[PDB]
Amino acid sequence: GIHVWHVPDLVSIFGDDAFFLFGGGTHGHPRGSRAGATANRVAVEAVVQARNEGRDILAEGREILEEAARWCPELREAMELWG
Amino acid sequence: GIHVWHVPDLVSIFGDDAFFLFGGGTHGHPRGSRAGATANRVAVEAVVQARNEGRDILAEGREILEEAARWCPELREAMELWG
Ligand SMILES: O=C(O)[C@@](O)(COP(=O)(O)O)[C@H](O)[C@H](O)COP(=O)(O)O
Numbered sequence: 459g460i461h462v463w464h465v466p467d468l469v470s471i472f473g474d475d476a477f478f479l480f481g482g483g484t485h486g487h488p489r490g491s492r493a494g495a496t497a498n499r500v501a502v503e504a505v506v507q508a509r510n511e512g513r514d515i516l517a518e519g520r521e522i523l524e525e526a527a528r529w530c531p532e533l534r535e536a537m538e539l540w541g
Numbered sequence: 542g543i544h545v546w547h548v549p550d551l552v553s554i555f556g557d558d559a560f561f562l563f564g565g566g567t568h569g570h571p572r573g574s575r576a577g578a579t580a581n582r583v584a585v586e587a588v589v590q591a592r593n594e595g596r597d598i599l600a601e602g603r604e605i606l607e608e609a610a611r612w613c614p615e616l617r618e619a620m621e622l623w624g
């Protein structure tokens with residue numbers, strides 16, 4: 459039962475050599491599966507980029523996700539729906 | 542100085558044989574011009590189609606635009622920002 463909000467913690471644990479499966483976190487998006495997949499893809503790619511830039515993921519996950527939703531609506535709707 | 546909110550009034554006054562120019566209503570979108578041009582395009586087609594459906598425009602413009610924004614992310618931002 460993972461969604462966009464769990465992306466920063468997941469990247470902290472598993473690094474880059476792992477699979478993240480969003481069963482209900484993709485199809486549960488308020489605008490279908492295409493938006494849900496884009497939201498998760500944007501969330502992961504944004505958190506990884508910040509980690510590669512030296513930011514502290516565990517502490518700045520919320521800020522990274524907000525900054526990415528600031529330019530991606532699909533992630534914005536995903537976050538405001540869950541958690 | 543016309544934005545998405547004025548589309549129900551513009552379509553009612555002018556009909557379908559006219560040009561609508563969104564100069565500052567396209568580039569003033571909180572996410573650029575390509576996002577702004579989509580919100581203007583979706584708003585017009587939603588109002589025009591709902592007029593071909595027989596629904597009243599001058600009274601149900603707000604509702605029509607809200608149903609359009611429910612599935613268009615670009616239109617939702619434009620309606621939130623202006624008015
Ligand atoms: O069957 C399910 O629920 C899932 O498809 C999750 O889909 P959602 O993402 O929609 O919950 C997973 O296969 C199980 O959770 C496996 O968990 P484990 O890896 O512990 O076996």
Ligand SMILES: O=C(O)[C@@](O)(COP(=O)(O)O)[C@H](O)[C@H](O)COP(=O)(O)O
Pocket residue numbers: 542543562563564565566
């Ligand atoms: O200069 C401007 O304001 C515009 O570029 C509109 O920009 P916005 O769309 O940002 O207002 C138009 O040329 C004038 O409004 C013309 O108005 P008229 O058609 O009455 O000459």
